[model samples]
Every structure is written in structure tokens, then in C-alpha cells.
Target: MIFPGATVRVTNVDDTYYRFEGLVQRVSDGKAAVLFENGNWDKLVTFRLSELEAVKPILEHHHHHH
Candidate 1:
């Protein structure tokens, strides 16, 4: 159930991100436009539905030990 606002990881391609993830901004034409933020600049990249998988929503409230 991929939907807008859901976090997704890029897969099926090696052009970017081994661990990086993006936000699902919109879905159209059987593809998704993902929003990736690096530093202060953000960019949207397109991916076919099969190239994405849901990622656990980030929880910033928890204290990080690592």
C-alpha cells in the first residue's frame, strides 16, 4: 500500500543510494515521484512501482545511541 507521504527505499537500480531513502510525493502513470533531500536542497526522482519498497517511517523522538 504505497501512498503519498510514505517513506520508500530505492531498489532495482544502483545509480543512487545504497541506504538512502525518499518520501513518496505522488504516484502517476504507474510510477512514483520520490522526494530526496540532501543538505538543504531537495530533488524529485522517478521510479517505477517495482523499484520501490516501503520503509519504516522515521521516528525522531527516540534517542539515538549509534
Candidate 2:
């Protein structure tokens, strides 16, 4: 699936939660260019295909208690 200008919540490969949110600008060769919702475009962050998970289309929303 292709997501453009959509907010994505990603988890780092190291399994860190609440990774970050950004707008997916493009995808190529399993790498994605994410325009951080809080940063400059020139500072666009890149993520590997395995590092991101689209959260907008989530099947359910829930709160986790620690």
C-alpha cells in the first residue's frame, strides 16, 4: 500500500514504542521519506520498510496501562 501525506506511527527496529509521527512523502527501494510533522523538509527522516507501521487505518484504538 502507498500512503502519501498520511500520518504514520512507527516502531523502531529495536522495539521502542512511541517512535514518532510523520507524513510519508515517498517510498523507494524499501526506504521511506517522512516529513516530520514538527521539523523542516530538508530534515526529512528516512525509515526502512521494516521500521514503520501505518496507524491511521488501525482496526482499533486503545489505551495501555502500565
Candidate 3:
């Protein structure tokens, strides 16, 4: 499910490329917007499309309506 428009969680955050938890805001022109799902509103960090990785959400389970 690691693709554009996929709900994702952060798996890594280090000195090098890092990560965040949220739904993919936008994916285009080799760029991506990862909204911070936590309490920090200013945590929105924009980066190259290849600068991050995605993981499953640990706090909640999503139930598809399909």
C-alpha cells in the first residue's frame, strides 16, 4: 500500500532521510506532502518523493467499507 493516496505511518526518522505519519497529501513532480497526524500542526515536512518510507498505523485499525 506504499503508493500515492495511501494512508501511511512513519517507519524511520534519522540524520539522513526521514519519515512521517499521515495520508499522502500530494504526489507529483517527484515531490510529496506528508501531513503530520500527531498533535503538531507545523510538522508538515515536504520532501522529495524518494526521501521517505511508509509503515502501517499502530494506533488504529482501518476497516474498509468495500
Backbone clashes (count) for model 2: 0
lDDT of 3: 0.58
lDDT of 2 by residue, 1-66 (tens): 546666676778464434777768888677887766544444567776567777665457777897
* lDDT at residue 36 of model 1 (Cα atoms): 96
* Best first by TM-score, ranked: 1, 2, 3
TM-score, structure 1 vs. true: 0.74
True-vs-predicted CA distance for residue 34, candidate 2, Å: 0.9
Maximum-TM-score candidate: 1
lDDT (Cα, 0-100) at 41 in candidate 3: 52
Task: Kindly give the stretch of ten consecutive residues in candidate 1 with the minimal lDDT sum.
Answer: 11-20
Taking every candidate in turn, the Cα RMSD to the unseen true structure, in Å, is 6.4, 8.6, 5.0
TM-score for predicted model 2 compared with the true structure: 0.58
Q: How many backbone clashes does candidate 3 have?
A: 0
Residues 1-66 of candidate 3 have per-residue lDDT tens digits of 356666655545652324445667887566676666555554555555555666655578658885
- Best by lDDT, which number? 1
Estimate the TM-score for candidate 3.
0.47
What's the residue-level lDDT of 3 in candidate 1? Answer: 89
Question: Which 10-residue span in candidate 2 carries the lowest summed lDDT?
Answer: 35-44
Worst 10 residues of 3 by lDDT: 11-20
State each model's CA lDDT, in order. 0.84, 0.67, 0.58
